[PDB]
Design a protein around this ligand. Sequence first.
Ligand SMILES: [Zn+2]
Ligand SMILES: [Zn+2]
Ligand SMILES: [Zn+2]
Ligand SMILES: [Zn+2]
Lengths: 70, 69
Amino acid sequence: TRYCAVCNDYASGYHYGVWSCEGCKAFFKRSIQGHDYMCPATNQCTIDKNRRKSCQACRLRKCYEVGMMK
Amino acid sequence: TRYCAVCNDYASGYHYGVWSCEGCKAFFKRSIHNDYMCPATNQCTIDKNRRKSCQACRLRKCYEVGMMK
DNA sequence: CTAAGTCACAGTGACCTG
DNA sequence: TCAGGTCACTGTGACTTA
Ligand SMILES: [Zn+2]
Ligand SMILES: [Zn+2]
Ligand SMILES: [Zn+2]
Ligand SMILES: [Zn+2]
């Protein structure tokens, strides 16, 4: 009930079942809406305030890991 | 056939002293004063489908391959 | 030819509507 | 309150001009 469970940025509220920022909220929104994300490395990127935009594959992976649901 | 020295995509021509696709050419141009951060460990596999994801490793490779500002 | 500009296009997220 | 939209901002790269 404070920080984003996905990128650890200031979370706005409870979105999709986890406390998240508007960024991760919108991201999951679109991801479940319809999109192929490609990880530029080893499917183990560090998702945070300044890396979430870089890897969409690991960001989505994390969205699910932390509990977000459709 | 020529391939982009940075991302292996079909190169458009010889840009900045190296063979590059239009993407890496414009990117390099834009970069030269952007400071980037790799999402992983600075060893990304930069190709057509991932060059947009890591900008740090893209610019790294731009210099590595000999692109001159 | 390449350098350099151009601009439609697509993702992001802060804000808005329901 | 949150889901789902929205749209200005921005980076991209294919194409145009010099
Ligand atoms: Zn977040
Ligand atoms: Zn990744
Ligand atoms: Zn390239
Ligand atoms: Zn990288």
